[PDB]
Structure formats: C-alpha cells, structure tokens
Amino acid sequence: MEFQRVHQQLLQSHHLFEPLSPVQLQELLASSDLVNLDKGAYVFRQGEPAHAFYYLISGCVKIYRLTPEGQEKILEVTNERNTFAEAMMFMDTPNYVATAQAVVPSQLFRFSNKAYLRQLQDNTPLALALLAKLSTRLHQRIDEIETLSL
Amino acid sequence: GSHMEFQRVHQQLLQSHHLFEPLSPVQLQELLASSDLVNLDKGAYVFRQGEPAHAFYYLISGCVKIYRLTPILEVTNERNTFAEAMMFMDTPNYVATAQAVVPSQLFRFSNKAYLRQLQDNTPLALALLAKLSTRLHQRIDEIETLSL
Numbered sequence: 001m002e003f004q005r006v007h008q009q010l011l012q013s014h015h016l017f018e019p020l021s022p023v024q025l026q027e028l029l030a031s032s033d034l035v036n037l038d039k040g041a042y043v044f045r046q047g048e049p050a051h052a053f054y055y056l057i058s059g060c061v062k063i064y065r066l067t068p069e070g071q072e073k074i075l076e077v078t079n080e081r082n083t084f085a086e087a088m089m090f091m092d093t094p095n096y097v098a099t100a101q102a103v104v105p106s107q108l109f110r111f112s113n114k115a116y117l118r119q120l121q122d123n124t125p126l127a128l129a130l131l132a133k134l135s136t137r138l139h140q141r142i143d144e145i146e147t148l149s150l
Numbered sequence: 151g152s153h154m155e156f157q158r159v160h161q162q163l164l165q166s167h168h169l170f171e172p173l174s175p176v177q178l179q180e181l182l183a184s185s186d187l188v189n190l191d192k193g194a195y196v197f198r199q200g201e202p203a204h205a206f207y208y209l210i211s212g213c214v215k216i217y218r219l220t221p222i223l224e225v226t227n228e229r230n231t232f233a234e235a236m237m238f239m240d241t242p243n244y245v246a247t248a249q250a251v252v253p254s255q256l257f258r259f260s261n262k263a264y265l266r267q268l269q270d271n272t273p274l275a276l277a278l279l280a281k282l283s284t285r286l287h288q289r290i291d292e293i294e295t296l297s298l
Binding site: 016075091092096124131134135139147 | 233
C-alpha cells in the first residue's frame with residue numbers, strides 16, 4: 001500500500017492539490033484511474049464528454065483543435081508533473097473543446113471532475129484559489145469588458 | 151446599534167439576493183457594520199470610471215446607468231447589485247461610470263468586508279465560481295488553453 005505515500009508526495013506539490021488535506025488527497029487518488037499511453041495515442045478527443053482532468057506523471061501531451069480543412073490549431077504542449085483539462089470543470093460545456101495526444105509514451109492519473117468538485121465543496125481555501133485563477137483568466141477579457149456585475 | 155437597527159431593518163431585503171443569502175448571521179452582521187444606505191439626486195455619480203474600487207452597490211429604488219468611455223453597458227434594474235465584479239479582477243480602480251438618472255436609493259457595501267466573509271463561506275465561493283464559469287463560457291472558438 002506504499003504507493004499512496006509516493007503519489008500523495010508528488011501531487012501535493014502541485015497548486016491544484018496543494019490546499020487539500022492529506023485525507024482529501026487520498027480520497028481523490030482513490031477514485032482516480034491510471035492511464036497508460038503509447039506515442040500517438042489519444043488522452044481524449046475533441047467532442048467527447050468531458051468528465052475528467054489529468055495529471056501527467058511521465059511523458060508529454062499536445063493539445064489542439066482540428067480545423068474543417070484538416071489542420072491542427074495548437075493550444076498547449078504539457079510537460080510531465082503538470083495538469084491539463086482542469087478548466088473544463090468551469091466551462092458551461094459538456095464536451096472536450098480540443099484533443100489531447102501523447103507525443104511520447106506517457107503515463108497519467110485521470111481524476112474525475114465530480115470527485116475533485118466534491119473535495120472543493122469542503123475546502124474554502126481551494127475554492128478561493130480557483131476563484132483567483134478563473135478571475136485572472138477572465139481579466140485578460142478587460143478590453144471588451146461588458147459588465148461590472150456577476 | 152445593539153438593537154442592530156441596520157441588519158434587523160435590511161436583512162429580509164438583502165437575503166433575497168444571491169450575494170448575501172448564503173452569509174451566516176455573523177457574516178452579514180460584519181458586512182453591514184461597514185455598509186451604508188445612500189440617497190442620490192437625479193444625475194449624481196455613484197462612482198466614476200477610473201476611480202478607486204472599494205465598494206459595490208445594491209440598487210434599492212431608482213435607476214442607475216453604467217457605461218464606458220471612447221477612444222454603453224447596462225441599466226441597473228431595481229433589486230440588483232452592481233460593481234461586484236471589481237472584487238474579481240486585478241485592477242484596483244473602477245473600469246466604468248455609474249450615474250443615477252433619477253433620485254435613487256442604494257446600499258453601499260465594503261469590498262474588503264465582503265471578501266473577508268467570503269474567506270469563511272464555501273457555498274458562496276462555489277456560487278461565485280459558477281457565475282464566473284458562465285462568463286468563461288465565452289471563449290467560443292476563442293479558447294486558447296484548457297488549464298487554469
């Protein structure tokens with residue numbers, strides 16, 4: 001059962017899991033899936049139901065939308081020990097808006113949106129942190145600021 | 151106070167709005183200790199574009215028009231708040247002008263005291279996250295990252 005110690009250890013450094021207590025982190029890991037991928041394999045495809053975000057244990061993932069004429073528009077390249085797709089929880093959209101593909105053999109933790117948000121419901125510090133993040137992401141929207149209400 | 155005139159008078163009204171309804175008795179008390187009721191004449195300014203942002207408002211009666219300047223935003227309906235978005239953007243000064251266009255009555259609330267309460271209120275922090283979520287539900291074909 002030693003593996004829980006080492007995984008708590010690397011995850012606790014990351015800002016998405018940091019404000020979580022040891023107890024909450026354990027519970028999040030308990031509902032996660034381990035995901036193994038070859039180079040070229042998809043983590044998820046654009047238009048698929050978005051129910052999970054990912055921590056990249058090892059490897060490298062590119063994120064892009066394919067256009068009507070076949071070409072990739074690239075969103076990001078994610079390096080190991082980083083998360084991706086967590087923004088999906090705070091979009092009013094059912095489906096992944098991009099595709100994520102491993103560019104080398106990779107290994108991930110897939111965390112449920114629903115399980116993470118369950119922890120959030122009893123972690124005010126974490127809620128406030130995400131509120132700060134969402135807020136910076138919606139202040140690069142301060143050229144066409146349409147309202148000062150919520 | 152002690153009678154706590156202010157909260158006992160105004161709590162029923164405020165508790166009908168989503169920004170204050172989740173606040174516990176004590177949290178509402180602490181918010182209100184730093185709140186005021188303001189009567190504005192036709193055409194006076196609640197605040198001006200470019201002015202420091204230390205308060206947000208609830209329009210009780212009357213009419214407030216909110217608009218930006220040029221190199222057109224919203225007519226605040228009675229029973230609605232405004233300027234609460236200033237708490238959740240990184241600029242410390244107001245980004246627009248609010249002017250009463252008839253004799254208006256408003257609540258003026260301290261941003262500092264409000265954010266203080268938010269620090270101990272997860273249901274409120276969640277509800278604000280859902281409100282920001284609907285705003286981020288812009289970036290239509292304009293989404294540039296899936297990270298936060």
